[PDB]
Amino acid sequence: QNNVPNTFTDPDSGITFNTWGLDEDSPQTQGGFTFGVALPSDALTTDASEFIGYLKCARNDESGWCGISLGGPMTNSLLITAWPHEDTVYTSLRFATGYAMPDVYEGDAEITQVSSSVNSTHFSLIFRCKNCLQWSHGGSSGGASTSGGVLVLGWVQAFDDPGNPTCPEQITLQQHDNGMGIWGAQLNTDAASPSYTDWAAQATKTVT
Numbered sequence: 544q545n546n547v548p549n550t551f552t553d554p555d556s557g558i559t560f561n562t563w564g565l566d567e568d569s570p571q572t573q574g575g576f577t578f579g580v581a582l583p584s585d586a587l588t589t590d591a592s593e594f595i596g597y598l599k600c601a602r603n604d605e606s607g608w609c610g611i612s613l614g615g616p617m618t619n620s621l622l623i624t625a626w627p628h629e630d631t632v633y634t635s636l637r638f639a640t641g642y643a644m645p646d647v648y649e650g651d652a653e654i655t656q657v658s659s660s661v662n663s664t665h666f667s668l669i670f671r672c673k674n675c676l677q678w679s680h681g682g683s684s685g686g687a688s689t690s691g692g693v694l695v696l697g698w699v700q701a702f703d704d705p706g707n708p709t710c711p712e713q714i715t716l717q718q719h720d721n722g723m724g725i726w727g728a729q730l731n732t733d734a735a736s737p738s739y740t741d742w743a744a745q746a747t748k749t750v751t
């Protein structure tokens with residue numbers, strides 16, 4: 544993904560994100576991928592605990608899932624998994640101590656949704672990730688530091704639908720097979736707005 548961020552304003556929410564991703568012509572993944580963040584107003588000076596995220600992920604004959612690692616590597620990092628079923632986008636907060644099926648994250652992080660969309664080729668989500676930037680699971684603790692002006696992030700996409708797709712806590716996954724990477728997601732001032740609190744208040748949907 545690009546390290547230097549693009550800037551994007553979602554029309555309906557009015558939320559402005561820094562974004563990074565891969566185009567549909569990228570050889571690194573099929574169908575493109577985009578991730579973005581909006582942060583608390585002082586995030587570039589003081590480490591935030593939360594963000595509002597944007598995900599745009601690909602579908603392969605209307606199947607597949609995508610994921611972000613908030614720490615970079617698959618392991619020892621809070622993981623966000625996302626996938627569509629019918630007209631709903633689900634997420635699951637996950638954590639892996641090794642290169643195997645990630646477990647449900649045991650910490651207090653919580654995702655709420657602002658909006659989502661599903662069509663035949665893509666799905667997208669805008670979501671608030673509360674208490675997501677510092678994590679603790681099974682004695683492993685870590686976090687990301689917005690005040691450093693960069694987030695080390697990982698992404699994956701996959702072609703198969705998760706098993707039990709209507710139950711985030713019980714999903715099963717195959718090893719992702721539609722690209723992966725770790726990159727430096729550089730942040731600029733567009734990523735932090737006085738409007739953050741108003742924007743976060745739009746995240747009123749809890750998708751169970």
Ligand code: HEM
Pocket residue numbers: 609610611612615616617618622623624637642643644645697698699716717718719723724725
């Ligand atoms: C049963 C499900 C899963 C299996 C078996 C699995 C397995 C693996 C394996 C073996 C690698 C190393 C590939 C290589 O080095 O070439 C890897 C890389 C990665 N995986 Fe997973 N994975 C699974 C689910 C996830 C989920 C849910 C996420 C995040 C939402 C994730 C994030 C990553 C990332 C970011 C990398 C690249 C960085 C790294 O090597 O640590 N994976 N995966």
Ligand SMILES: *[C@@H]1O[C@H](CO)[C@@H](O)[C@H](O)[C@H]1NC(C)=O
Pocket residue numbers: 599660661662663664665666667
């Ligand atoms: C399909 O939905 C995605 C959601 O992000 C959107 O970006 C894309 O333009 C849509 N395509 C069509 C043909 O409607």
Ligand SMILES: *[C@H]1O[C@H](CO)[C@@H](O)[C@H](O)[C@@H]1O
Pocket residue numbers: 557736737738739741
């Ligand atoms: C962020 O967004 C809020 C709500 O849309 C605006 O009122 C404000 O000017 C800031 O740019």
Ligand SMILES: *[C@H]1O[C@H](CO)[C@@H](O)[C@H](O)[C@@H]1O
Pocket residue numbers: 737738739740741
């Ligand atoms: C959300 O709430 C904060 C309070 O910290 C305001 O300062 C901001 O303008 C937004 O309305």
Ligand SMILES: *[C@H]1O[C@H](CO)[C@@H](O)[C@H](O)[C@@H]1O
Pocket residue numbers: 745746747748
């Ligand atoms: C919280 O807020 C949105 C509108 O901002 C509602 O449409 C949604 O159903 C939830 O109640």
Ligand SMILES: *[C@H]1O[C@H](CO)[C@@H](O)[C@H](O)[C@@H]1O
Pocket residue numbers: 655747748749750
């Ligand atoms: C949906 O429900 C969760 C708890 O189930 C709340 O924390 C959230 O703010 C939204 O109301």
Ligand SMILES: [Mg+2]
Pocket residue numbers: 691692693729730
């Ligand atoms: Mg920077």
